[PDB]
């Protein structure tokens, strides 16, 4: 009972790709490490001027959707406006072959 | 891109120790992400604000 300061929000110890990890308490830390390593290698969209902005490498998908889950932060990272992948409907089944 | 703007990088040398700053320290709170590290020979070298 002798505080002088409180943080704005405990969620904001993170970084850029660490914002995108949904529920980042609810896994193990090396999974967050591979996720932050992996997210730099994602396609999607990068800018909007790409009909003019020439470069050697460029990867644009077709139908980008904002993710169904999100945290509050990537609203501020503008990631809702310009997303990385799109949602899909995944299964967990050992479906006998592959 | 918005990751890659805020990068930091130290020089150390070839082999180095381990208690020396290759691994993370308690002083790092509120400043640098304790997850966004690159992997492979330079983990704990590059770090992200």
């Amino acid at each position: 009972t002798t505080f002088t300061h409180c943080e704005i929000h405990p969620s904001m110890i993170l970084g850029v790709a660490a914002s995108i990890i949904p529920f980042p308490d609810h896994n193990q830390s090396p999974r967050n490490t591979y996720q932050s390593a992996m997210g730099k290698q994602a396609m999607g969209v990068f800018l909007t001027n790409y009909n003019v902005r020439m470069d050697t490498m460029a990867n644009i998908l077709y139908y980008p959707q904002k993710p169904l889950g999100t945290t509050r932060a990537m609203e501020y990272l503008k990631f809702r406006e310009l997303p990385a992948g799109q949602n899909a409907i995944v299964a967990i089944a050992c479906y006998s072959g592959y | 891109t918005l990751s890659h703007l805020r990068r930091t990088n130290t020089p150390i040398g070839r082999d180095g120790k381990l208690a020396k700053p290759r691994q993370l320290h308690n002083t790092h709170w509120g400043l640098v992400c304790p997850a966004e590290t690159p992997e492979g020979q330079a983990c704990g070298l590059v770090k992200n604000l």
């Binding site: 704005i8 509050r72 501020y76 | 703007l5 805020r6």
Partner: peptide, 30 residues
Amino acid sequence: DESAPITAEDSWAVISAFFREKGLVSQQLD
């Protein structure tokens, strides 16, 4: 009241004002 304390929900507006002022590339820009 306006002089009430602040619930944990509220601080996102503070984050809004902070980012609208600084911007993300503020370090390099400054």
